[PDB]
Amino acid sequence: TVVGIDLGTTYSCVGVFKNGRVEIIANDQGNRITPSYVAFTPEGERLIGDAAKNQLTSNPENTVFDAKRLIGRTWNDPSVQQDIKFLPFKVVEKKTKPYIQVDIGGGQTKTFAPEEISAMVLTKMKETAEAYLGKKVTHAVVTVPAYFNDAQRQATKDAGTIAGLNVMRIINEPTAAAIAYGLDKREGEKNILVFDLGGGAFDVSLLTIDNGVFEVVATNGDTHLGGEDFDQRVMEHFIKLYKKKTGKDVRKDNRAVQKLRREVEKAKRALSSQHQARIEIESFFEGEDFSETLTRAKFEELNMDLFRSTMKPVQKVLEDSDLKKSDIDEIVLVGGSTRIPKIQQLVKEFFNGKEPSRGINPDEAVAYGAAVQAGVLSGDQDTGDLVLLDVCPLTLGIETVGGVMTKLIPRNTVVPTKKSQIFSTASDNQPTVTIKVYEGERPLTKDNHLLGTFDLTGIPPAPRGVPQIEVTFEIDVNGILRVTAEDKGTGNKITITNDQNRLTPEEIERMVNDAEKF
Ligand SMILES: Nc1ncnc2c1ncn2[C@@H]1O[C@H](COP(=O)(O)OP(=O)(O)O)[C@@H](O)[C@H]1O
């Protein structure tokens, strides 16, 4: 039986379609969502979910969370380096990637790829489903933010593979929410705007939905904007206030910083229904206490630039779809951070007073849609009609002379899709031709994101310009690129090497074996 898993920055959620309805499956503590946390105790036990989150403040250096903020990224990504300040666990460079180092007991250190931490969370979600169903689960539909790039998508698929899941399909979070909203609606064509603000990533998608046919027309997002940033703004405010008032810098005391996290998260949630919240920490730093009152006004002020920046993707989507505000028929809010009154206010005011769709739990709707998609793809006949057209989030291009982004596949193209181009050599007997592929909307490649460097190898000896090598760039239904090459000369095997350094089957097998030790 195939399940849907929403693998989220702060929480994850698992659903199954069975007997004609979605069940959101409760974990072994009775909770319909599970924290995306993993911890290693001094005694050598591994904890996942609620139990891991519960001991953050007593064992901060060996409690891992927010792995989705690191997954599929390089070490020098500014989103990685900015986030290190607020994470209690050591982040070390390895394979040009941010790895996570922890103590597993007896002095002993272990280093993990972000994929391996996310695999442990997926395994706990799988086990939650297996307990409910009373049998093994080997197949799943797993979520990603719509604006996740090629590397982030592949790394999430690899986490699935490490967790013993055949990932049937990667689904974009707002698309999943749209399915939850729109399955079995027979209203004819409606324009639906999904505003998806979770713990770590932000997406906006505009879909048409018409009697079981769903199409993403335009999407735009920010993969490093979410609830964790709102917390960290408030945390930094108090870390600096403490140093100003006392002289003492607490940024290296991990217990101090993560006790502040715990209190800030609590206060933030309270401030969605109250106007003031009390922050209290006993033995915050060097045996001293910390008490501060946080008003809703101050919380809003500390985050207002980030809140107002959520309108940037909304306008980008309206521009790309050539629609006006008045053409939007329904606004669907998902992600837990859409509970923030100021966020609701900003969206409502942007659409001239339009109220959001009712009956949608912003914590669960993404998993609900993923579970529907799993059931449909399995061959269920008691599911609602579902035909889905989804898109690539980023323009792919190739670097040409002058550091120029030459466009190959535009953003918002329905996937799967492909494009071919003929390449040749610049020098006599040249054996290798290198192609650099970028992701982004800027005219120069230095302002876009490098996807990969691909080498066409084994070009047979000939005079410059004579070889004719057709290279095909295909984005599959998961949004992941595959590059292949064929010799179109008159009367050779052309192999492509790349610098992406994906996890190999050998490496994955080692990671599966290492996870079995706990
Ligand atoms: N009532 C609330 N007020 C403010 N923020 C909330 C509220 N409920 C949940 N959140 C935030 O939403 C995020 C949780 O989003 P959710 O969709 O449940 O999981 P994920 O963050 O993994 O997407 C967290 O950052 C959390 O602080």
PDB file of all heavy atoms in Angstrom, residues 6-12 33 36 68 173 196-200 226-228 231 265 268-272 334-341 362-364, ligand 1:
ATOM      1  N   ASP A   6       4.374  14.009   3.758  1.00  0.00           N
ATOM      2  CA  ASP A   6       4.827  15.391   3.722  1.00  0.00           C
ATOM      3  C   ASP A   6       6.070  15.464   4.618  1.00  0.00           C
ATOM      4  O   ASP A   6       5.943  15.427   5.828  1.00  0.00           O
ATOM      5  CB  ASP A   6       3.756  16.350   4.237  1.00  0.00           C
ATOM      6  CG  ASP A   6       4.200  17.798   4.210  1.00  0.00           C
ATOM      7  OD1 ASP A   6       5.194  18.115   3.495  1.00  0.00           O
ATOM      8  OD2 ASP A   6       3.551  18.638   4.887  1.00  0.00           O
ATOM      9  N   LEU A   7       7.244  15.543   3.997  1.00  0.00           N
ATOM     10  CA  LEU A   7       8.529  15.647   4.692  1.00  0.00           C
ATOM     11  C   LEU A   7       8.795  17.147   4.884  1.00  0.00           C
ATOM     12  O   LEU A   7       9.267  17.826   3.968  1.00  0.00           O
ATOM     13  CB  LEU A   7       9.649  15.013   3.851  1.00  0.00           C
ATOM     14  CG  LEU A   7      11.070  15.083   4.411  1.00  0.00           C
ATOM     15  CD1 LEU A   7      11.184  14.447   5.796  1.00  0.00           C
ATOM     16  CD2 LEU A   7      12.033  14.436   3.422  1.00  0.00           C
ATOM     17  N   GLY A   8       8.480  17.675   6.061  1.00  0.00           N
ATOM     18  CA  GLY A   8       8.546  19.126   6.287  1.00  0.00           C
ATOM     19  C   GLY A   8       9.764  19.572   7.087  1.00  0.00           C
ATOM     20  O   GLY A   8      10.450  18.762   7.708  1.00  0.00           O
ATOM     21  N   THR A   9      10.040  20.867   7.045  1.00  0.00           N
ATOM     22  CA  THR A   9      11.213  21.417   7.722  1.00  0.00           C
ATOM     23  C   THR A   9      11.129  21.152   9.226  1.00  0.00           C
ATOM     24  O   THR A   9      12.085  20.673   9.857  1.00  0.00           O
ATOM     25  CB  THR A   9      11.354  22.942   7.470  1.00  0.00           C
ATOM     26  OG1 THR A   9      11.453  23.196   6.056  1.00  0.00           O
ATOM     27  CG2 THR A   9      12.594  23.474   8.179  1.00  0.00           C
ATOM     28  N   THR A  10       9.987  21.491   9.805  1.00  0.00           N
ATOM     29  CA  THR A  10       9.807  21.378  11.262  1.00  0.00           C
ATOM     30  C   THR A  10       8.968  20.170  11.682  1.00  0.00           C
ATOM     31  O   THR A  10       9.260  19.552  12.714  1.00  0.00           O
ATOM     32  CB  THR A  10       9.222  22.667  11.871  1.00  0.00           C
ATOM     33  OG1 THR A  10       7.902  22.847  11.399  1.00  0.00           O
ATOM     34  CG2 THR A  10      10.013  23.865  11.468  1.00  0.00           C
ATOM     35  N   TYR A  11       7.949  19.830  10.892  1.00  0.00           N
ATOM     36  CA  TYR A  11       7.083  18.660  11.118  1.00  0.00           C
ATOM     37  C   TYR A  11       6.871  17.869   9.855  1.00  0.00           C
ATOM     38  O   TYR A  11       6.856  18.437   8.768  1.00  0.00           O
ATOM     39  CB  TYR A  11       5.688  19.078  11.572  1.00  0.00           C
ATOM     40  CG  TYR A  11       5.627  19.689  12.938  1.00  0.00           C
ATOM     41  CD1 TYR A  11       5.577  21.066  13.105  1.00  0.00           C
ATOM     42  CD2 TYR A  11       5.619  18.887  14.076  1.00  0.00           C
ATOM     43  CE1 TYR A  11       5.540  21.628  14.379  1.00  0.00           C
ATOM     44  CE2 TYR A  11       5.564  19.441  15.343  1.00  0.00           C
ATOM     45  CZ  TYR A  11       5.526  20.814  15.487  1.00  0.00           C
ATOM     46  OH  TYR A  11       5.461  21.345  16.758  1.00  0.00           O
ATOM     47  N   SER A  12       6.653  16.567  10.016  1.00  0.00           N
ATOM     48  CA  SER A  12       6.262  15.692   8.924  1.00  0.00           C
ATOM     49  C   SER A  12       4.904  15.028   9.211  1.00  0.00           C
ATOM     50  O   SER A  12       4.456  14.964  10.369  1.00  0.00           O
ATOM     51  CB  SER A  12       7.370  14.665   8.696  1.00  0.00           C
ATOM     52  OG  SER A  12       8.560  15.354   8.308  1.00  0.00           O
ATOM     53  N   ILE A  33       0.903  14.935  13.480  1.00  0.00           N
ATOM     54  CA  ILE A  33       2.162  15.395  12.893  1.00  0.00           C
ATOM     55  C   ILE A  33       3.327  15.027  13.816  1.00  0.00           C
ATOM     56  O   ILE A  33       3.152  14.895  15.023  1.00  0.00           O
ATOM     57  CB  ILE A  33       2.142  16.916  12.575  1.00  0.00           C
ATOM     58  CG1 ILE A  33       1.971  17.780  13.839  1.00  0.00           C
ATOM     59  CG2 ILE A  33       1.066  17.208  11.530  1.00  0.00           C
ATOM     60  CD1 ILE A  33       1.964  19.278  13.565  1.00  0.00           C
ATOM     61  N   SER A  36      10.321  16.900  12.851  1.00  0.00           N
ATOM     62  CA  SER A  36      11.407  16.436  11.974  1.00  0.00           C
ATOM     63  C   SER A  36      12.737  16.587  12.728  1.00  0.00           C
ATOM     64  O   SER A  36      13.614  17.357  12.341  1.00  0.00           O
ATOM     65  CB  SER A  36      11.412  17.221  10.660  1.00  0.00           C
ATOM     66  OG  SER A  36      10.191  17.067   9.949  1.00  0.00           O
ATOM     67  N   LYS A  68      16.196  19.838   6.338  1.00  0.00           N
ATOM     68  CA  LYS A  68      15.633  20.307   5.066  1.00  0.00           C
ATOM     69  C   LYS A  68      16.207  21.668   4.624  1.00  0.00           C
ATOM     70  O   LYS A  68      16.206  21.960   3.432  1.00  0.00           O
ATOM     71  CB  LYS A  68      14.105  20.380   5.163  1.00  0.00           C
ATOM     72  CG  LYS A  68      13.400  20.576   3.824  1.00  0.00           C
ATOM     73  CD  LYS A  68      11.905  20.381   3.984  1.00  0.00           C
ATOM     74  CE  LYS A  68      11.118  20.707   2.716  1.00  0.00           C
ATOM     75  NZ  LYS A  68       9.658  20.541   2.949  1.00  0.00           N
ATOM     76  N   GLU A 173       4.681  20.756  -2.962  1.00  0.00           N
ATOM     77  CA  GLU A 173       3.803  21.022  -1.807  1.00  0.00           C
ATOM     78  C   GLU A 173       2.512  21.791  -2.163  1.00  0.00           C
ATOM     79  O   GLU A 173       1.416  21.365  -1.753  1.00  0.00           O
ATOM     80  CB  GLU A 173       4.598  21.659  -0.652  1.00  0.00           C
ATOM     81  CG  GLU A 173       5.573  20.662   0.008  1.00  0.00           C
ATOM     82  CD  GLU A 173       6.695  21.285   0.839  1.00  0.00           C
ATOM     83  OE1 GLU A 173       6.622  22.474   1.202  1.00  0.00           O
ATOM     84  OE2 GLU A 173       7.694  20.579   1.116  1.00  0.00           O
ATOM     85  N   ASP A 196       1.810  29.053   0.394  1.00  0.00           N
ATOM     86  CA  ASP A 196       2.316  27.924   1.198  1.00  0.00           C
ATOM     87  C   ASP A 196       3.522  28.404   1.987  1.00  0.00           C
ATOM     88  O   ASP A 196       4.607  28.505   1.438  1.00  0.00           O
ATOM     89  CB  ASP A 196       2.691  26.789   0.257  1.00  0.00           C
ATOM     90  CG  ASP A 196       3.085  25.485   0.976  1.00  0.00           C
ATOM     91  OD1 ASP A 196       3.201  25.412   2.207  1.00  0.00           O
ATOM     92  OD2 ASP A 196       3.274  24.487   0.252  1.00  0.00           O
ATOM     93  N   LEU A 197       3.320  28.698   3.275  1.00  0.00           N
ATOM     94  CA  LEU A 197       4.384  29.232   4.145  1.00  0.00           C
ATOM     95  C   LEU A 197       4.552  28.322   5.353  1.00  0.00           C
ATOM     96  O   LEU A 197       3.778  28.385   6.316  1.00  0.00           O
ATOM     97  CB  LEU A 197       4.075  30.674   4.560  1.00  0.00           C
ATOM     98  CG  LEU A 197       5.125  31.437   5.385  1.00  0.00           C
ATOM     99  CD1 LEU A 197       6.366  31.715   4.566  1.00  0.00           C
ATOM    100  CD2 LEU A 197       4.541  32.737   5.921  1.00  0.00           C
ATOM    101  N   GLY A 198       5.578  27.473   5.299  1.00  0.00           N
ATOM    102  CA  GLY A 198       5.815  26.468   6.333  1.00  0.00           C
ATOM    103  C   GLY A 198       6.906  26.852   7.299  1.00  0.00           C
ATOM    104  O   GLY A 198       7.048  28.021   7.656  1.00  0.00           O
ATOM    105  N   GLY A 199       7.672  25.856   7.750  1.00  0.00           N
ATOM    106  CA  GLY A 199       8.733  26.093   8.713  1.00  0.00           C
ATOM    107  C   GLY A 199      10.024  26.592   8.116  1.00  0.00           C
ATOM    108  O   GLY A 199      10.823  27.234   8.797  1.00  0.00           O
ATOM    109  N   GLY A 200      10.265  26.264   6.854  1.00  0.00           N
ATOM    110  CA  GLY A 200      11.522  26.603   6.214  1.00  0.00           C
ATOM    111  C   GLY A 200      11.487  27.163   4.801  1.00  0.00           C
ATOM    112  O   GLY A 200      12.435  27.822   4.405  1.00  0.00           O
ATOM    113  N   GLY A 226      10.778  30.915   6.076  1.00  0.00           N
ATOM    114  CA  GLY A 226       9.724  30.194   6.785  1.00  0.00           C
ATOM    115  C   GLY A 226       9.706  30.525   8.264  1.00  0.00           C
ATOM    116  O   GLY A 226      10.443  31.414   8.728  1.00  0.00           O
ATOM    117  N   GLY A 227       8.882  29.782   8.997  1.00  0.00           N
ATOM    118  CA  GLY A 227       8.683  29.996  10.428  1.00  0.00           C
ATOM    119  C   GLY A 227       9.958  29.978  11.255  1.00  0.00           C
ATOM    120  O   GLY A 227      10.083  30.725  12.226  1.00  0.00           O
ATOM    121  N   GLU A 228      10.912  29.143  10.861  1.00  0.00           N
ATOM    122  CA  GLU A 228      12.210  29.089  11.556  1.00  0.00           C
ATOM    123  C   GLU A 228      12.946  30.436  11.490  1.00  0.00           C
ATOM    124  O   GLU A 228      13.591  30.835  12.470  1.00  0.00           O
ATOM    125  CB  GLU A 228      13.071  27.943  11.034  1.00  0.00           C
ATOM    126  CG  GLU A 228      12.568  26.547  11.423  1.00  0.00           C
ATOM    127  CD  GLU A 228      12.710  26.241  12.918  1.00  0.00           C
ATOM    128  OE1 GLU A 228      11.818  26.600  13.710  1.00  0.00           O
ATOM    129  OE2 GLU A 228      13.721  25.631  13.309  1.00  0.00           O
ATOM    130  N   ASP A 231      11.386  32.813  14.082  1.00  0.00           N
ATOM    131  CA  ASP A 231      11.916  32.482  15.412  1.00  0.00           C
ATOM    132  C   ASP A 231      13.311  33.065  15.592  1.00  0.00           C
ATOM    133  O   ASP A 231      13.620  33.647  16.639  1.00  0.00           O
ATOM    134  CB  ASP A 231      12.010  30.958  15.622  1.00  0.00           C
ATOM    135  CG  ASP A 231      10.674  30.299  15.896  1.00  0.00           C
ATOM    136  OD1 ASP A 231       9.615  30.945  15.830  1.00  0.00           O
ATOM    137  OD2 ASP A 231      10.694  29.080  16.167  1.00  0.00           O
ATOM    138  N   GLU A 265       9.404  29.881  20.160  1.00  0.00           N
ATOM    139  CA  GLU A 265       8.421  29.121  19.372  1.00  0.00           C
ATOM    140  C   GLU A 265       7.068  29.127  20.082  1.00  0.00           C
ATOM    141  O   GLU A 265       6.046  29.427  19.470  1.00  0.00           O
ATOM    142  CB  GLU A 265       8.926  27.686  19.106  1.00  0.00           C
ATOM    143  CG  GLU A 265       7.938  26.723  18.438  1.00  0.00           C
ATOM    144  CD  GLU A 265       7.596  27.035  16.983  1.00  0.00           C
ATOM    145  OE1 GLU A 265       8.310  27.822  16.298  1.00  0.00           O
ATOM    146  OE2 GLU A 265       6.596  26.443  16.502  1.00  0.00           O
ATOM    147  N   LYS A 268       5.604  32.731  19.920  1.00  0.00           N
ATOM    148  CA  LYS A 268       5.098  32.984  18.572  1.00  0.00           C
ATOM    149  C   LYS A 268       3.695  32.404  18.346  1.00  0.00           C
ATOM    150  O   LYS A 268       2.820  33.084  17.824  1.00  0.00           O
ATOM    151  CB  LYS A 268       6.055  32.416  17.523  1.00  0.00           C
ATOM    152  CG  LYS A 268       5.589  32.643  16.082  1.00  0.00           C
ATOM    153  CD  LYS A 268       6.548  32.069  15.061  1.00  0.00           C
ATOM    154  CE  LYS A 268       6.588  30.547  15.141  1.00  0.00           C
ATOM    155  NZ  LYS A 268       7.347  29.988  14.000  1.00  0.00           N
ATOM    156  N   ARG A 269       3.506  31.144  18.717  1.00  0.00           N
ATOM    157  CA  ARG A 269       2.210  30.465  18.549  1.00  0.00           C
ATOM    158  C   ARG A 269       1.114  31.142  19.364  1.00  0.00           C
ATOM    159  O   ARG A 269       0.029  31.385  18.853  1.00  0.00           O
ATOM    160  CB  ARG A 269       2.304  28.999  18.981  1.00  0.00           C
ATOM    161  CG  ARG A 269       3.127  28.133  18.056  1.00  0.00           C
ATOM    162  CD  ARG A 269       3.411  26.780  18.705  1.00  0.00           C
ATOM    163  NE  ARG A 269       3.871  25.819  17.715  1.00  0.00           N
ATOM    164  CZ  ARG A 269       3.091  25.094  16.901  1.00  0.00           C
ATOM    165  NH1 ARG A 269       1.755  25.181  16.927  1.00  0.00           N
ATOM    166  NH2 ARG A 269       3.660  24.270  16.035  1.00  0.00           N
ATOM    167  N   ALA A 270       1.423  31.447  20.626  1.00  0.00           N
ATOM    168  CA  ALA A 270       0.523  32.207  21.507  1.00  0.00           C
ATOM    169  C   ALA A 270       0.134  33.560  20.902  1.00  0.00           C
ATOM    170  O   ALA A 270      -1.031  33.968  20.989  1.00  0.00           O
ATOM    171  CB  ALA A 270       1.165  32.412  22.871  1.00  0.00           C
ATOM    172  N   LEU A 271       1.098  34.242  20.273  1.00  0.00           N
ATOM    173  CA  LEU A 271       0.834  35.556  19.673  1.00  0.00           C
ATOM    174  C   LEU A 271      -0.062  35.532  18.423  1.00  0.00           C
ATOM    175  O   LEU A 271      -0.435  36.593  17.937  1.00  0.00           O
ATOM    176  CB  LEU A 271       2.147  36.313  19.401  1.00  0.00           C
ATOM    177  CG  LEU A 271       2.907  36.801  20.636  1.00  0.00           C
ATOM    178  CD1 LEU A 271       4.313  37.239  20.253  1.00  0.00           C
ATOM    179  CD2 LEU A 271       2.176  37.933  21.350  1.00  0.00           C
ATOM    180  N   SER A 272      -0.409  34.346  17.907  1.00  0.00           N
ATOM    181  CA  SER A 272      -1.441  34.220  16.869  1.00  0.00           C
ATOM    182  C   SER A 272      -2.873  34.327  17.405  1.00  0.00           C
ATOM    183  O   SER A 272      -3.795  34.552  16.617  1.00  0.00           O
ATOM    184  CB  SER A 272      -1.299  32.913  16.081  1.00  0.00           C
ATOM    185  OG  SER A 272      -0.136  32.919  15.273  1.00  0.00           O
ATOM    186  N   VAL A 334      -1.787  27.260   3.134  1.00  0.00           N
ATOM    187  CA  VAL A 334      -1.240  26.057   3.790  1.00  0.00           C
ATOM    188  C   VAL A 334       0.148  26.354   4.339  1.00  0.00           C
ATOM    189  O   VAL A 334       0.749  27.380   4.014  1.00  0.00           O
ATOM    190  CB  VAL A 334      -1.207  24.816   2.870  1.00  0.00           C
ATOM    191  CG1 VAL A 334      -2.616  24.356   2.541  1.00  0.00           C
ATOM    192  CG2 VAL A 334      -0.394  25.079   1.606  1.00  0.00           C
ATOM    193  N   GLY A 335       0.634  25.453   5.181  1.00  0.00           N
ATOM    194  CA  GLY A 335       1.809  25.701   6.004  1.00  0.00           C
ATOM    195  C   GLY A 335       1.416  26.362   7.306  1.00  0.00           C
ATOM    196  O   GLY A 335       0.595  27.301   7.329  1.00  0.00           O
ATOM    197  N   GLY A 336       2.017  25.912   8.406  1.00  0.00           N
ATOM    198  CA  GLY A 336       1.626  26.404   9.739  1.00  0.00           C
ATOM    199  C   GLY A 336       1.786  27.908   9.984  1.00  0.00           C
ATOM    200  O   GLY A 336       1.029  28.492  10.775  1.00  0.00           O
ATOM    201  N   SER A 337       2.745  28.537   9.303  1.00  0.00           N
ATOM    202  CA  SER A 337       3.000  29.974   9.460  1.00  0.00           C
ATOM    203  C   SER A 337       1.911  30.866   8.868  1.00  0.00           C
ATOM    204  O   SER A 337       1.892  32.076   9.147  1.00  0.00           O
ATOM    205  CB  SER A 337       4.354  30.369   8.869  1.00  0.00           C
ATOM    206  OG  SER A 337       5.423  29.729   9.524  1.00  0.00           O
ATOM    207  N   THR A 338       0.991  30.292   8.076  1.00  0.00           N
ATOM    208  CA  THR A 338      -0.161  31.049   7.595  1.00  0.00           C
ATOM    209  C   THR A 338      -1.196  31.279   8.708  1.00  0.00           C
ATOM    210  O   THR A 338      -2.167  31.984   8.479  1.00  0.00           O
ATOM    211  CB  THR A 338      -0.846  30.416   6.361  1.00  0.00           C
ATOM    212  OG1 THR A 338      -1.378  29.128   6.694  1.00  0.00           O
ATOM    213  CG2 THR A 338       0.144  30.281   5.197  1.00  0.00           C
ATOM    214  N   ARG A 339      -0.984  30.691   9.888  1.00  0.00           N
ATOM    215  CA  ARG A 339      -1.778  31.052  11.064  1.00  0.00           C
ATOM    216  C   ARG A 339      -1.456  32.430  11.647  1.00  0.00           C
ATOM    217  O   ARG A 339      -2.270  32.963  12.408  1.00  0.00           O
ATOM    218  CB  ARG A 339      -1.623  30.006  12.160  1.00  0.00           C
ATOM    219  CG  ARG A 339      -2.221  28.673  11.775  1.00  0.00           C
ATOM    220  CD  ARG A 339      -2.382  27.784  12.979  1.00  0.00           C
ATOM    221  NE  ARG A 339      -3.058  26.539  12.612  1.00  0.00           N
ATOM    222  CZ  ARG A 339      -2.504  25.333  12.582  1.00  0.00           C
ATOM    223  NH1 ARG A 339      -1.225  25.149  12.919  1.00  0.00           N
ATOM    224  NH2 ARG A 339      -3.250  24.279  12.228  1.00  0.00           N
ATOM    225  N   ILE A 340      -0.295  32.995  11.306  1.00  0.00           N
ATOM    226  CA  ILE A 340       0.124  34.308  11.818  1.00  0.00           C
ATOM    227  C   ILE A 340      -0.860  35.371  11.322  1.00  0.00           C
ATOM    228  O   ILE A 340      -1.009  35.552  10.112  1.00  0.00           O
ATOM    229  CB  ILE A 340       1.581  34.683  11.401  1.00  0.00           C
ATOM    230  CG1 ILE A 340       2.590  33.717  12.037  1.00  0.00           C
ATOM    231  CG2 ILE A 340       1.904  36.116  11.857  1.00  0.00           C
ATOM    232  CD1 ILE A 340       3.999  33.789  11.497  1.00  0.00           C
ATOM    233  N   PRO A 341      -1.538  36.091  12.245  1.00  0.00           N
ATOM    234  CA  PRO A 341      -2.529  37.083  11.791  1.00  0.00           C
ATOM    235  C   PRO A 341      -2.020  38.105  10.775  1.00  0.00           C
ATOM    236  O   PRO A 341      -2.750  38.465   9.843  1.00  0.00           O
ATOM    237  CB  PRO A 341      -2.969  37.764  13.099  1.00  0.00           C
ATOM    238  CG  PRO A 341      -2.782  36.698  14.124  1.00  0.00           C
ATOM    239  CD  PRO A 341      -1.544  35.960  13.712  1.00  0.00           C
ATOM    240  N   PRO A 362      -3.985  23.901   7.604  1.00  0.00           N
ATOM    241  CA  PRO A 362      -2.719  24.206   6.917  1.00  0.00           C
ATOM    242  C   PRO A 362      -1.546  23.289   7.300  1.00  0.00           C
ATOM    243  O   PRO A 362      -0.523  23.264   6.584  1.00  0.00           O
ATOM    244  CB  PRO A 362      -2.439  25.664   7.326  1.00  0.00           C
ATOM    245  CG  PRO A 362      -3.166  25.845   8.621  1.00  0.00           C
ATOM    246  CD  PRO A 362      -4.394  25.006   8.497  1.00  0.00           C
ATOM    247  N   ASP A 363      -1.676  22.556   8.408  1.00  0.00           N
ATOM    248  CA  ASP A 363      -0.668  21.575   8.813  1.00  0.00           C
ATOM    249  C   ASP A 363      -0.784  20.239   8.093  1.00  0.00           C
ATOM    250  O   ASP A 363       0.200  19.511   8.071  1.00  0.00           O
ATOM    251  CB  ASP A 363      -0.740  21.256  10.320  1.00  0.00           C
ATOM    252  CG  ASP A 363      -0.301  22.409  11.215  1.00  0.00           C
ATOM    253  OD1 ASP A 363       0.603  23.204  10.873  1.00  0.00           O
ATOM    254  OD2 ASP A 363      -0.881  22.512  12.316  1.00  0.00           O
ATOM    255  N   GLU A 364      -1.967  19.907   7.558  1.00  0.00           N
ATOM    256  CA  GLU A 364      -2.285  18.540   7.061  1.00  0.00           C
ATOM    257  C   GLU A 364      -2.623  18.446   5.562  1.00  0.00           C
ATOM    258  O   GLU A 364      -2.559  17.372   4.984  1.00  0.00           O
ATOM    259  CB  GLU A 364      -3.455  17.952   7.869  1.00  0.00           C
ATOM    260  CG  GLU A 364      -3.193  17.857   9.374  1.00  0.00           C
ATOM    261  CD  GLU A 364      -4.324  17.196  10.160  1.00  0.00           C
ATOM    262  OE1 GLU A 364      -5.370  16.848   9.572  1.00  0.00           O
ATOM    263  OE2 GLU A 364      -4.158  16.997  11.380  1.00  0.00           O
TER     264      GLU A 364
HETATM  265  N1  LIG B   1      -0.519  29.085  15.536  1.00  0.00           N
HETATM  266  C1  LIG B   1       0.658  29.332  14.924  1.00  0.00           C
HETATM  267  N2  LIG B   1       1.178  30.583  14.860  1.00  0.00           N
HETATM  268  C2  LIG B   1       2.357  30.850  14.251  1.00  0.00           C
HETATM  269  N3  LIG B   1       3.104  29.891  13.654  1.00  0.00           N
HETATM  270  C3  LIG B   1       2.691  28.594  13.649  1.00  0.00           C
HETATM  271  C4  LIG B   1       1.421  28.229  14.290  1.00  0.00           C
HETATM  272  N4  LIG B   1       1.270  26.896  14.139  1.00  0.00           N
HETATM  273  C5  LIG B   1       2.349  26.437  13.456  1.00  0.00           C
HETATM  274  N5  LIG B   1       3.186  27.457  13.172  1.00  0.00           N
HETATM  275  C6  LIG B   1       4.474  27.380  12.450  1.00  0.00           C
HETATM  276  O1  LIG B   1       4.355  26.660  11.234  1.00  0.00           O
HETATM  277  C7  LIG B   1       5.528  25.874  11.033  1.00  0.00           C
HETATM  278  C8  LIG B   1       5.000  24.458  10.954  1.00  0.00           C
HETATM  279  O2  LIG B   1       4.492  24.264   9.639  1.00  0.00           O
HETATM  280  P1  LIG B   1       3.967  22.815   9.212  1.00  0.00           P
HETATM  281  O3  LIG B   1       3.345  22.994   7.843  1.00  0.00           O
HETATM  282  O4  LIG B   1       3.174  22.220  10.349  1.00  0.00           O
HETATM  283  O5  LIG B   1       5.331  21.961   9.171  1.00  0.00           O
HETATM  284  P2  LIG B   1       6.610  22.444   8.335  1.00  0.00           P
HETATM  285  O6  LIG B   1       7.165  23.628   9.050  1.00  0.00           O
HETATM  286  O7  LIG B   1       7.558  21.283   8.408  1.00  0.00           O
HETATM  287  O8  LIG B   1       5.970  22.736   7.003  1.00  0.00           O
HETATM  288  C9  LIG B   1       6.464  26.134  12.208  1.00  0.00           C
HETATM  289  O9  LIG B   1       7.441  27.125  11.874  1.00  0.00           O
HETATM  290  C10 LIG B   1       5.520  26.649  13.270  1.00  0.00           C
HETATM  291  O10 LIG B   1       6.123  27.543  14.201  1.00  0.00           O
END
